[PDB]
Amino acid sequence: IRRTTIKVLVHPFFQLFILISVLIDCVFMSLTNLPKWRPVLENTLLGIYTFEILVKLFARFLGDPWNWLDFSVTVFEVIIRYSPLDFIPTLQTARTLRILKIIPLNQGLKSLVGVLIHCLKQLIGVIILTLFFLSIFSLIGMGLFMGNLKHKCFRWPQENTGNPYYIRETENFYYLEGERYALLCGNRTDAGQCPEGYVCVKAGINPDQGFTNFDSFGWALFALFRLMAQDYPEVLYHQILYASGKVYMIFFVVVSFLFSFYMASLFLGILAMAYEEEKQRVMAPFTDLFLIICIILNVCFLTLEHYPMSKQTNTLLNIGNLVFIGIFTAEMIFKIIAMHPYGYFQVGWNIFDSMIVFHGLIELCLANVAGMALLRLFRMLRIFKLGKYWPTFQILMWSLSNSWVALKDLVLLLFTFIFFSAAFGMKLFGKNYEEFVCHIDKDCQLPRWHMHDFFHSFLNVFRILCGEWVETLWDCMEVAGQSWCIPFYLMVILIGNLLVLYLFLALVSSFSSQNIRKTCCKIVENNWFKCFIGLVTLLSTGTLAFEDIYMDQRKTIKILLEYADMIFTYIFILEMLLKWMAYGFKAYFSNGWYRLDFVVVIVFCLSLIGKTREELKPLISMKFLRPLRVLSQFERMKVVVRALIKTTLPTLNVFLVCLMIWLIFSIMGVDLFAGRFYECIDPTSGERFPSSEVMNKSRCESLLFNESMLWENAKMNFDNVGNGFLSLLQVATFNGWITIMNSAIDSVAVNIQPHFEVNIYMYCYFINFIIFGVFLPLSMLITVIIDNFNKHKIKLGGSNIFITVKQRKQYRRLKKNKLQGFIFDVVTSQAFNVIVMVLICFQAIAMMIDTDVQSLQMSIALYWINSIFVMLYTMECILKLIAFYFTIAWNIFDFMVVIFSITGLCLPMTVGSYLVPPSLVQLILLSRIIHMLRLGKGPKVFHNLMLPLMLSLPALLNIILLIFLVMFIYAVFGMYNFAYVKKEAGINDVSNFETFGNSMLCLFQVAIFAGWDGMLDAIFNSKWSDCDPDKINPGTQVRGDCGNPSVGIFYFVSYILISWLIIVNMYIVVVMEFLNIASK
Amino acid sequence: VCVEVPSETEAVQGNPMKLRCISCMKREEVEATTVVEWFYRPEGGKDFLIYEYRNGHQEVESPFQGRLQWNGSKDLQDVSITVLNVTLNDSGLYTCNVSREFEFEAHRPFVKTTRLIPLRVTEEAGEDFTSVVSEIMMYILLVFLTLWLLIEMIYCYRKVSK
Ligand SMILES: CCCCCCCCCCCCCCCCCC(=O)O[C@@H](COC(=O)CCCCCCCCCCCCCCC)COP(=O)(O)OCCN
Ligand SMILES: CCCCCCCCCCCCCCCCCC(=O)O[C@@H](COC(=O)CCCCCCCCCCCCCCC)COP(=O)(O)OCCN
Ligand SMILES: CCCCCCCCCCCCCCCCCC(=O)O[C@@H](COC(=O)CCCCCCCCCCCCCCC)COP(=O)(O)OCCN
Ligand SMILES: CC(C)CCC[C@@H](C)[C@H]1CC[C@H]2[C@@H]3CC=C4C[C@@H](O)CC[C@]4(C)[C@H]3CC[C@]12C
Ligand SMILES: CCCCCCCCCCCCCCCC(=O)O
Ligand SMILES: CCCCCCCCCCCCCCCC(=O)O
Ligand SMILES: CCCCCCCCCCCCCCCC(=O)O
Ligand SMILES: *[C@@H]1O[C@H](CO)[C@@H](O)[C@H](O)[C@H]1NC(C)=O
Ligand SMILES: *[C@@H]1O[C@H](CO)[C@@H](O)[C@H](O)[C@H]1NC(C)=O
């Protein structure tokens, strides 16, 4: 009856046979569209899986939750196929659930997922605190911005066909040249500005089919979840700063500081604790230099190949390759003489070197003609031969070899989940992408990104794991409706991020395994002398911010600054020639800081001679090095610069390996795409001709009867290794990568017009780059940074290396009635305190109900609610005054809140004036909700999760001040160089270098990687003469219009490097404090 | 990128002078058929004629030509004019009545913006007042700042003696 069952169930072939069966099912369901056999195969597998159920359920069955899936899927399928029911589309969806069986059928993955789901219960606190903060900031967002994005330029005075989903109302509203939505504008001085003959009005639809708005709760929470991911944010900043003033930019800074930094550091620190909690529970031999030189030259010969390339150097590189195989095939048949080869093929490296010599004597005889070009792609493998001599590469690779047995399961689980999500998405949404294609794309064709087939859905999932989700989710909601699309995307985002980050932590864990002399020597050191020159240093720094385009309009100020520069240089000269009196001449140059001061005195001297002669005027640019004087003046900066040197310079040793991998990928690109990105365009509209009209270049340059045509290159291309590195850097930051990938997948051959999506499989190149060149090296750097941070934390102890010795005492202080007015015995009661909290909560929930479109009977019934709440607060304040000081700080905050609330609800005595804006009082009352973080008066986990910010405020203050000084230097230098650039692409009416404010907003969105490519593509206006070298600019002494690519590239690359290195340390500072508190 | 700035209203015998005049467009993106007219400048009826712009430059066909030069920008955003060897007779108001027209292929709006400046060609320009008062203030400050140090390297020196 139930005896023989075991002899099947535990024999290993009953496992292997079903594993094979599932892999057949999931391949034939997905990587194939071959029909006329799908009515035979499914009726077979419905036999096998029923043999599985009718075996396994006799031995035991519901004791393991995986058996609920196995039974509940197959019983539903069996109810379908043979009964009158026929929900055929739903049947094929459920079968995709079988893919998940790979988890329980592989005990390793079953246990890994078991311990991961067990440890998931540590997160509940952070998830609630995050949703709490998102709710508060989305109420604030509804306060500041509700309704603003309906603003447009309305034609005034009013006077008396196609794809229906793209008609524009251009008779009534004003549109830019190519944009889909009307121009945003606002009444404020610094908002957008109407063209002449238009007036600002609130009318019609929001952007983005309505999905981008703050007009209700819900969508505001969508916007804040978008900002927390900081996914494609810069268009939202542009829209808000066009609908309202630049002053509102403070909001997005605060939001990105709280959410994109602190919360993510809490999640990362908790998962990094859970990982260790889990882990604790478990004949010419010597002559070599010749051959290493005959490696490095071979490396260099590979890099010189580019496009175009004349035959008289092609034959050079061809002989070079032949010569080097004429060396390697000598040395092999030297080493195969060491008595025998049975040691030769025993050592691990030679079972690679002999592959190199076999490849290099394939591609020389009968693979020269009629052979496939990708055979040459393997030539790059030669650079790894350099690794034989290089201990760092060897010991990293050895550290990877050690960890193999563990990483296997995490990689296989992640691949399983990607494949499941891809299949389930293809079956759930695929049909809609073609039934309603006309909403998604004009001319009614499938776009580049969709879900209509398995490969595009796979790419869409990999993209969601990279981020980028919002721009596809808009099309999902536009095509399939929101209630289906939202749960799918949110599932993929959450479980994806969890797996990706747990794998990142696993990699990091793997890798980590004459008395005048005494006079001057006193005058130099009295503290007043220090503070005076410090003040002069900050004055001499801040005065550079005034040199914007309005310099000639501020006619008076210029003359004052013109003399102030000479005052400042005089003071610094009498500083220098005093120190040399005091310290002794030689001891001045011994000390590194005074050397930097001396360089700044030279900058001041050169700057003042240069402006006296026109031929030396370029010297006046030198003064932008002045801010460097701050760095050596103030004690707080020096400790930070030393902590960055102490922590980050030792990473140089491993950085060369990452540069080697990037060089490998760059050559691997130059070989495969160079010269093929050329295309033939309409010279006015920039769109391409179709391949049917102008197949090759010869028609792109016809004999003048019809030549409305231009042949030109593409801004980003792989024509040589130096463009390769830049395109790779642009891929690595996920900025503009989609334009490169579109170029790649469209490309045919050197002189052939590129055609839409011909070799779609090239996405493997960028997938492989994203895996091996970015993700692994990044952790290879972070593990070294952490190892030195621990080293120094042990070499002296100390709260941090980022704080001055005075601040350590602050750190250690911070870490630490009778006259029948019996109201004292009442106001103290828990019963009163809980009531106060219930009031605060009700007032916030009674604020969530508000919406933009709203009937007056509701608006007044919200107004009298907020008035009742101000009455209750005033009554409790009056009662509190009987049981009694203004000594408690929170009791000052509450009394300020009450005064400000009434002086707003009633304004000036409830009749006095206007322009106190409605919904100010709501935010005033809302501010009290901060009480729900105090120790004795709220959920204890919110305090325990906020404690790291308290215990780390000083180091963050120091680091923020250094980031601000660096942003100041780069702002001034960019404000001097890139003004007057023609407005284009990512240079517009809000982000530009016209003034210090806009330059700071540019450098901010650069630091967050919110589209630096859109600025670089504007600086490259000279790349095809889209500019006017001599244009007069009104009101200004500067003629011309041109960027300079060579300076642009250097500027952006250096700023990105420095910012990333600082921000990484800023993350470390928080994560290690969380991990220190969590020790107890 | 455009900036609007007043003109100098002061001119020196025996030199040219530039009468700058700037009128920004609220949107830099659009295009407009500009017209520019400069008025007569005399102690009777000022409106008479100076140098008009229609589709190409034209001539004043009166006696206020020859000592004139077009110094305006290529796109007519700026319409500055230079007068040559200003003489004592030259004096009083100048007026520039620019006007523009836009074409959005729906409604054709028209806007007009006057701009007017006096000038007097004084016998010779005196020095600017600000650029001497500020040089006094600078030299005074640099005297004080160099007696202060000396006072210190008296007091401290005397203290160090012992
Ligand atoms: C399309 C959804 C948007 C519309 C509606 C939004 C509604 C609000 C959603 C409420 C979310 C509350 C928690 C938010 C946590 C976000 C995770 C996070 O950002 O923290 C870190 C990452 O998160 C984690 O490490 C932990 C995440 C685990 C949280 C959930 C555990 C498993 C829950 C599975 C349940 C399945 C849900 C099914 C839908 C009902 C930082 O990484 P990053 O996103 O900044 O960098 C991106 C790199 N590619
Ligand atoms: C022993 C002590 C251990 C203590 C641990 C403490 C850890 C300290 C924390 C250090 C702070 C780290 C700063 C940022 C961490 C987040 C890094 C990450 O998870 O992903 C990055 C990796 O970059 C990416 O490429 C994201 C997309 C990756 C695709 C995932 C697919 C790869 C999976 C295939 C596995 C095969 C691996 C090969 C195995 C041999 C994304 O960078 P970003 O956009 O968040 O940068 C911030 C922007 N200003
Ligand atoms: C650990 C973090 C703590 C979380 C708890 C936060 C709870 C605090 C909530 C209090 C928010 C304080 C904002 C008060 C600013 C008042 C905004 C306002 O309405 O100003 C009026 C005056 O206009 C101005 O903009 C003046 C300059 C104020 C703008 C400042 C915006 C930045 C606000 C920063 C939000 C961050 C607050 C949380 C800080 C932790 C706008 O009237 P309007 O007529 O122009 O608009 C309607 C016309 N259609
Ligand atoms: C000092 C005043 C005047 C300006 C504000 C200084 C500090 C707080 C500013 C300047 C640069 C800003 C940072 C710029 C980039 C990032 C990376 C992002 O992933 C999280 C936010 C974060 C970390 C910002 C936090 C706020 C920030 C650090
Ligand atoms: C309809 C799709 C559902 C898919 C998920 C089904 C539930 C899987 C649960 C697995 C739990 C693993 C842990 C078991 C207990 C342990 O080992 O601690
Ligand atoms: C932790 C789960 C939170 C889920 C929150 C989902 C909020 C996003 C969806 C907002 C939908 C708003 C109403 C849609 C219909 C409309 O536009 O009128
Ligand atoms: C204005 C340019 C940006 C400057 C950014 C860095 C500012 C550093 C401020 C340091 C404060 C030091 C306080 C003590 C000074 C003293 O002893 O007089
Ligand atoms: C493409 O070039 C070939 C020769 O290389 C030529 O025969 C053909 O006509 C060209 N295609 C055109 C002109 O469309
Ligand atoms: C320019 O403007 C007025 C417009 O009324 C015009 O009639 C006259 O010619 C000029 N007058 C002034 C004061 O600018």
Residue numbers in the entry:
A (entry chain A): 107 to 166, 175 to 274, 283 to 404, 503 to 733, 921 to 1223, 1238 to 1304, 1308 to 1504
B (entry chain B): 25 to 186
Please, what does the article write about this entry?
Here, to gain insight into its atypical physiology, we determine structures of the human NaX channel in complex with the auxiliary β3-subunit. NaX reveals structural alterations within the selectivity filter, voltage sensor-like domains, and pore module. Instead, the S6-gate remains closed, membrane lipids fill the central cavity, and the domain III-IV linker restricts S6-dilation.
To facilitate cryogenic electron microscopy (cryo-EM) analysis, human NaX was co-expressed with the canonical auxiliary β3-subunit, purified in mild detergent (glyco-diosgenin), and reconstituted into phospholipid nanodiscs. Prior to sample vitrification, the Na+ concentration was raised above the threshold reported to activate NaX (to 200 mM), and the resulting cryo-EM reconstruction of the β3-NaX complex extended to 3.2 Å resolution. The NaX channel resembles a four-leaf clover with VSLDs arranged in a domain-swapped organization. The β3-subunit is wedged between extracellular loops of the pore module and its single transmembrane helix is positioned against VSLD3. The intracellular DIII–DIV linker is bound alongside the pore (see below), and the carboxyl-terminal domain is not well-resolved, establishing that the overall architecture of NaX is highly similar to available human NaV channel structures determined in detergent. Despite the high Na+ concentration in our sample, no distinguishing extracellular Na+ binding site was observed, and residues lining the narrow S6-gate form a hydrophobic barrier to the passage of hydrated ions, defining a nonconductive state. Four lipids penetrate the lateral pore fenestrations in NaX to enter the central cavity. These features can unambiguously be assigned as three phospholipids and one cholesterol, where one phospholipid even straddles and seals the intracellular S6-gate. The NaX DIII–DIV linker is bound to a pore module receptor site reminiscent of the fast-inactivated state in NaV channels. The DIII–DIV linker therefore appears to restrict S6-dilation in NaX and may stabilize the nonconductive state.
